[PDB]
Amino acid sequence: MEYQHWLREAISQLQASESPRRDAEILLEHVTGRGRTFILAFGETQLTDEQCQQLDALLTRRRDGEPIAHLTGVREFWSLPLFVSPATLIPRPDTECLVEQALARLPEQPCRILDLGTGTGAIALALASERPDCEIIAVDRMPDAVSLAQRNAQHLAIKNIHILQSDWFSALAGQQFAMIVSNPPYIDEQDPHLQQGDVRFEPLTALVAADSGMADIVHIIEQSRNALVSGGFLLLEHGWQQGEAVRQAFILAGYHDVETCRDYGDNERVTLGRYY
Amino acid sequence: AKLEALHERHEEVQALLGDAQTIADQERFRALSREYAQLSDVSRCFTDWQQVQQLQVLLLPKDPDDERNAFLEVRAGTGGDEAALFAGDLFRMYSRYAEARRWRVEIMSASEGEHGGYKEIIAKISGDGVYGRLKFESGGHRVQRVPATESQGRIHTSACTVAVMPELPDAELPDVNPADLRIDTFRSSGAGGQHVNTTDSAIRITHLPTGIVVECQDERSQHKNKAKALSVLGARIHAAEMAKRQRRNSDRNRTYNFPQGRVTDHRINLTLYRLDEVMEGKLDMLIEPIIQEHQADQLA
Ligand SMILES: Nc1ncnc2c1ncn2[C@@H]1O[C@H](CSCC[C@H](N)C(=O)O)[C@@H](O)[C@H]1O
């Protein structure tokens, strides 16, 4: 069959998507290993049988809603290539913001950073990348997340990062970092989003927090205290609506210099405080 | 008796330079030495019109960005969804051409035709001597075809616009980005973060001052699209202090008529009965001429 043909076909039976052509083009690229432009400039190309069959399986999934990054297994974050899997979350663009705000605060002097619920290793990696003079430490509860994280770390060649498997701080028993970053689960067990989107195929282990999606964020700002160096920062990502909320637990818990930066979707994504 | 004035200056400067190049010298003997490598061809000729088709020395009107890589975008205008459809054709034609001579063509933003085309589409072509070779392609391109969405067979005139900026070493960019710019999101709205996950990220950047607008979207990291966008804003900026400079080859540049199969560069009164060829990637039976042409203009 023809690249141009397949693309035409798939896009059809893929209308329920928010980006059919793209979904299409990506898949076709993935299988054939030819870029977007090629596919566009040369739709006369035939597909070897395999390709057509391989393209087929992946397509069914995607009709059942399975995320694209789940099908191709990769995701870029901070211009850094991360392997992802339904073992954790697919690193989001807004999360890049957390990282941005955290890069400023970081002390001009080499230091140690902690990443709670690192997941794929997104945040931790991007940082240990920017600050090769700092020792970051990413921990995760699910044992599989720990591995994807280590797998990325290897593939990426970043060595000033260290992955562990604690439940928030258990394994950290006795350490204090300059800055503590964390995008924990902050979705309500029953937010209508869980209902729709690729987010149907993502784990609750990483999606749902308790107390109406606020359980973890708080338990962390609480814990974080006993682990931050003098005036070190603690910054968390949260839901678009948990703006004022998170701000308070931050003040109530006793955090100096509270603040709430906004991402490019002009939502409220990162809340950052300090401590003494 | 006028241009010879030039030679009797160069032949002079070369002689002058060929000397310093024989004294105890280090450092930037590079800049100076290189000049010699230049004044040498121009000089070797004058020293003959004197020692003697006297090949009119065309070695005088220098150029700049010519070799730099280039950004190229196709915009849809006049005509219904017909035009965006030709945005496609045009863009293929270029990429089909950029490949024939192994250039790196890479998209950085696309606008799916409301029915199968491109409102926008902007590639980043790469290879040596790019800009100085597609610049002329800037301007307006007009089609007169008989749409497949028509059977009565009457031709339909639609048109597209084409911008062909230059690739500035992003390692040269003027860090034109304090707070003097507004980085926005395509998402007409959204909850973002965890709640939703789309297959690709789209950024947008507006230059508060000059008001320039740039945007991008692909399956990659936001970090990348943005930074990618920063590079196009720059090329878009430098594309102002060039259009500032006042036959200086939308302004109908060409017209592509299929019932006739002809293509015509209004700009140089050249019409060729080779539309097939031009649509498949043969843009040299056109770029070449408008080139020698833009040449003679300079030879005055
Ligand atoms: N007690 C706990 N300790 C460590 N990680 C935990 C945890 N409870 C939940 N998590 C982790 O919380 C993460 C939420 S999603 C974090 C994703 C990450 N920012 C990215 O961009 O990929 C999941 O990886 C989940 O395994």
Quote the CA–CA distance of B259 and B271 in Å, as a whole number.
14
**A25 burial type by CB count under 10 A (0-12 exposed, 13-18 middle, 19+ buried):** buried
Quote the CA–CA distance of B226 and B204 in Å, as a whole number.
7
A227 close to A54: Cβ distance less than 8 angstroms = no
* Experimental approach taken: X-ray
Quote the CA–CA distance of A274 and B253 in Å, as a whole number.
61
One fold for B1-65 and B177-245: no
Q: Considering CB atoms only, which of A96, A186, A238 is closest to B222?
A: A96
Tell me the binding residues of A.
Answer: 117-121, 140, 168, 183-186
Task: Among A84, A146, A152, A183, say which to mutate for ligand 1: greatest number of ligand atoms within 8 Å of CB.
Answer: A183
Residue range B66-168+253-300 in CATH 1.10.3720.10: no
Q: How many CB atoms lie within 10 A of CB B251?
A: 9
Distances (CA, A) of A2 to A7, A43, A50, A53, A263: 8, 6, 14, 13, 41
Closest CA to A188 of A199, A201, A174, A173: A199
Quote the CA–CA distance of A28 and A99 in Å, as a whole number.
32
> Structure tokens of B291?
């080139």
Strand-pair category, A268-274 with A228-237: antiparallel
Tell me the binding residues of A for substrate.
Answer: 183-186
Q: Considering CB atoms only, which of B107, B123, B199 is closest to A26?
A: B199
Per domain, the residue ranges of chain B are 1-65, 66-168+253-300, 177-245
Bridge partners of B254, per DSSP, are B141, B265
Amino acid found at B230: L
Closest CA to A111 of A123, A95, A126, A128: A128
Handedness of CA A205, A209, A215, A217 (dihedral sign): positive
Residue in chain A lying closest to B281 (CA): A41
Query: What is the distance in angstroms between the Cα of A170 and the nearest Cα belonging to chain B?
Result: 25
Question: For residue A56, what are the contacts with CB-CB under 8 A and spacing of at least 6?
Answer: none
B95 close to A40: Cβ distance less than 8 angstroms = yes
Residue in chain A lying closest to B202 (CA): A93
Q: How wide is the angle at C-alpha B108 spanned by C-alphas B168 and B191, nearest 5°?
A: 125
Can you give the length of chain B in residues?
A: 300
Query: Which residue's CA is minimally distant from atom 17 of ligand 1?
Result: A119
A6 close to A28: Cβ distance less than 8 angstroms = yes
Q: How many CB atoms lie within 10 A of CB A64?
A: 9
Quote the CA–CA distance of B1 and B86 in Å, as a whole number.
52
Quote the CA–CA distance of B235 and B130 in Å, as a whole number.
14
Residues of chain A with C-beta less than 8 angstroms from the C-beta of B126: none
Closest CA to B156 of B267, B81, B68: B81
Distances (CA, A) of A205 to A70, A201, B106, B215: 17, 12, 38, 35
Residues of chain A with C-beta less than 8 angstroms from the C-beta of B220: 76, 79
**Rg of chain B over all Cα atoms, to the nearest angstrom:** 24
CATH number for B1-65 (one of 1.10.10.10, 1.10.630.10, 6.10.140.1980, 3.30.930.10): it is 6.10.140.1980
Q: Which domains does chain A have, with CATH numbers?
A: 1-84 (1.10.8.10), 85-276 (3.40.50.150)
Distances (CA, A) of A263 to A6, A121, A173, A237, B197: 37, 20, 33, 10, 15
CATH code linked to domain B177-245: 3.30.160.20
> Structure tokens of B108?
């950085």
Q: How many CB atoms lie within 10 A of CB A168?
A: 17
